[PDB]
Design a protein around this ligand. Structure first.
Ligand SMILES: Nc1nc2c(ncn2[C@@H]2O[C@H](COP(=O)(O)O)[C@@H](O)[C@H]2O)c(=O)[nH]1
Ligand SMILES: Nc1nc2c(ncn2[C@@H]2O[C@H](COP(=O)(O)O)[C@@H](O)[C@H]2O)c(=O)[nH]1
Ligand SMILES: Nc1nc2c(ncn2[C@@H]2O[C@H](COP(=O)(O)O)[C@@H](O)[C@H]2O)c(=O)[nH]1
Ligand SMILES: Nc1nc2c(ncn2[C@@H]2O[C@H](COP(=O)(O)O)[C@@H](O)[C@H]2O)c(=O)[nH]1
Ligand code: NA
Ligand code: NA
Ligand SMILES: [Zn+2]
Ligand SMILES: [Zn+2]
Lengths: 430, 429
């Protein structure tokens, strides 16, 4: 009917938190319902490992790390996550001849440094790490099934292409669900390659159609489908990937399983722009995660991303201009934990009075209110900027209470623990 | 002819389908908060005249576990109050035998009690309410009970709860939880709200004369001032259910003139040593400090994790009961040793990360165990079965790490989940 349709999961038997997430399939905020129980099957597109990672990559993976911590630590969902490592790619192939070291040896180098940068930022590793080099055989069988479903064709040179026209014809299949308006050997220019016949002096793999490499998009559909299956609760990535990469993943997986909805919720992180231009290796405006870590700490970098809503675009000001606010917040969190611990330590039950005073009750009321504010923020599509503000306000009032008033030791311990619980959800470490 | 219980409405509340053994209904009922996800919780505290023993440990560690389940696992919001009974006949007697002040004795054993609690990793409550600091509030509480014509004053200057006037009212039933357990008095079963003090005994000025608060009035006063007319949870040991807890309900119902002061009354079962309750008087008791020179806090918490909070349990001394606990503590320790070392020393550069069938089978048992434990916690805090679920999962993880090629991310997830459950249990590794 010229409009793509979206089927919300049924609510019976599912964990309902009334969480709302910005879903790129509906281009709106919708209630999140698991496919099965409280389980969330989640695939996230990974890096292409030919170079150092930069602050833009940090934005995406730290942002979805925070969302993952919110889902699992805060809401107690059960998340099964997969991230691919794209270790075969044209950029890796070209760089390996420039570097005069093996392609595989170059790919491990930058995958290792990528995971070390993620660990440095306190990013949790996914459940499964799926490398393209280890899945080429699975990829080929995936392409075969797409061909048997008559949604792909083979060129004489030995490449394989996705037949978009055959895909559209089916009433159950719509091409480019998320960006409908973004649309030689080929039937049509809009067809894309699943298998590429191998260029000379290029790494290659055996296949029924000839020596070749996987195409850009087939890696993700194959790996995600083998481990997670015919329905994905969440698929994530940066916004630039929405078309053509993610829409093509949907086309390949729908073609493979012959069904209409491979993914219930598609989440796209907004881009990090430096001076109004996206941070890209090509532009030469980029800042490596390692350089960033020599001036600033993991907490400060995470606070930078906490201050910017995950699905919005953000602008980083270099020379620490944007980092000035972050350093202030990290400095005050550190000082807070210092004080409240000294006051808990020096508290003496025998000499203090433990009457529940009016000052105590006022702080307690603010403490329970702040718990409910933060809960609404997380339900409001992971509004970490406002949740972080709630904690700062609560800390300002705790500082006043501790300085003057007589302190209820138990109340202060409870508040320290809640703030610890929220900071663990953020990935901050104090 | 039987008291009725009104379940809170589910509308607007956090509903977990949790079921708790409620002494008011003498059955298992679904737990519904009074307001949203908030739980107002009052727990009867110790009388600070002596060292705490393993029985006190059973009650407070068991309800610490329940509190951790409620807050850490289910993400409820718990506002808790515990009284310290620092004025009491037992404190007065002990203070004269030792020839020390009533307050100096109470502070000493209050301090050792909180130190014993910290040693067992028992979380402190939000508010600690001492009777000596609330004597004025207690008096004003008794006044309102008298104005509602549910209490009367004797010639000596004492005040007594008029049970018969309380029963007459249709909105009030006396002794809801133990209905069959029922001189100056109108009736012998009336109990004192205010006791006229002998001149030597410590006392406080009051409208009816110098006196002390009675046994039960302290708790109704303090819980009502901080938490109010409705208590989501009131907890204590089983022997306290009558007359102490039933009298708390009568006093609070009389004060507020309503029918239900507490939605859910949870009573931990008693710890018996050689078939008799651990009591200072019997001389069968084991202090928490003595216990901690023989066994560790984790081992002691595992003992109470193995015994369901609301059931009676028998401790066999000379380490008979503790042998099982020490084995479990040993196996948790060794499991964490391996999984932590393999996570640290895992090297992404040299490893193969294909999602193998062994990886998929461990993952399936891992998610299955999450659902088993979830059902156990909903089943009235069945920590013994949740603990067994963890043990089963740990046996299979040990095999996986020893033999299979390990998915570093999957092992991190399992390490994180088991830590999350151990924090809910209060274990520290
Ligand atoms: N990307 C995409 N565009 C489609 C599809 N079907 C129709 N359209 C677009 O929608 C317009 C309406 O044509 P119809 O929907 O009747 O085929 C066409 O001009 C075509 O560009 C489809 O499956 N995928
Ligand atoms: N936020 C943000 N994400 C980026 C940027 N550049 C790449 N990404 C994201 O980082 C992930 C991996 O990056 P890749 O290595 O594919 O360039 C992708 O999901 C992509 O969307 C950037 O400048 N900002
Ligand atoms: N425990 C208890 N028993 C009551 C109450 N009201 C009446 N009863 C019992 O019910 C029986 C019937 O007496 P009535 O209900 O006429 O007072 C009495 O023998 C009395 O024991 C009450 O509030 N509490
Ligand atoms: N499980 C258990 N609890 C006890 C024992 N003795 C006292 N308690 C509990 O410990 C708490 C404080 O005891 P108290 O200081 O009032 O003697 C009360 O809630 C009481 O129920 C015992 O032998 N076993
Ligand atoms: Na794009
Ligand atoms: Na009793
Ligand atoms: Zn991808
Ligand atoms: Zn009490």
């Amino acid at each position: 009917g010229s409009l793509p349709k979206w089927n919300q999961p049924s609510k019976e038997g599912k964990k309902i938190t009334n969480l709302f997430v910005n879903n790129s399939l509906t281009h709106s905020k919708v209630e999140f319902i698991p496919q099965e129980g409280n389980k969330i099957k989640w695939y996230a597109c990974g890096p292409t490992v030919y170079d150092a990672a930069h602050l833009g990559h940090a934005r995406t993976y730290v942002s979805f790390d925070i969302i993952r911590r919110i889902l699992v630590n805060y809401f107690k969902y059960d998340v099964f996550m997969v991230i691919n490592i794209t270790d075969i790619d044209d950029k890796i192939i070209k760089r390996s001849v420039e570097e005069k070291i093996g392609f595989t040896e170059l790919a491990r180098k930058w995958e290792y440094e990528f995971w070390e940068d993620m660990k440095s930022l306190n990013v949790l590793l996914p459940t499964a790490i799926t490398r393209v080099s280890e899945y080429v055989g699975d990829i080929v069988k995936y392409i075969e099934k797409i061909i048997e479903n008559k949604y792909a064709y083979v060129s004489e040179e030995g490449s394989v292409y996705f037949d978009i026209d055959e895909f559209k014809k089916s009433e159950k299949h719509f091409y480019a669900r998320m960006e409908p308006l973004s649309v030689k050997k080929k039937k049509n220019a809009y067809d894309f390659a699943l298998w590429k016949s191998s260029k000379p002096n290029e790494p290659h793999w055996d296949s029924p159609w000839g020596k070749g490499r996987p195409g850009w998009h087939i890696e993700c559909s194959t790996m995600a489908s083998n481990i997670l299956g015919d329905v994905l609760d969440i698929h994530s990535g940066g916004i630039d990937l929405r078309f053509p990469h993610h829409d093509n993943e949907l086309a390949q997986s729908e073609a493979f399983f012959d069904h209409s909805q491979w993914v219930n919720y598609f989440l796209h992180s907004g881009h990090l722009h430096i001076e109004g231009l996206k941070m890209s290796k090509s532009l030469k405006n980029f800042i490596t995660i390692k350089n960033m870590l020599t001036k600033y700490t993991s907490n400060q970098i995470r606070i930078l991303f906490l201050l910017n809503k995950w699905d919005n675009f953000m602008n980083y000001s270099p020379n620490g201009e944007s980092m000035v606010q972050c350093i202030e917040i990290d400095k005050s969190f550190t000082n807070f934990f210092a004080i409240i611990l000294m006051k808990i330590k020096n508290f003496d039950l025998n000499s203090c009075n433990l009457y529940w005073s009016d000052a105590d009750n006022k702080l307690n009321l603010l403490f329970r209110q702040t718990k409910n504010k933060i809960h609404e923020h997380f339900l409001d599509n992971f509004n970490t900027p406002d949740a972080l503000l709630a904690i700062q306000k609560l800390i300002t009032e705790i500082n006043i209470y501790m300085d003057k008033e007589k302190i209820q030791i138990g109340l202060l311990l409870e508040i320290k623990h809640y703030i610890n619980f929220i900071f663990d959800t953020f990935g901050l470490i104090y």
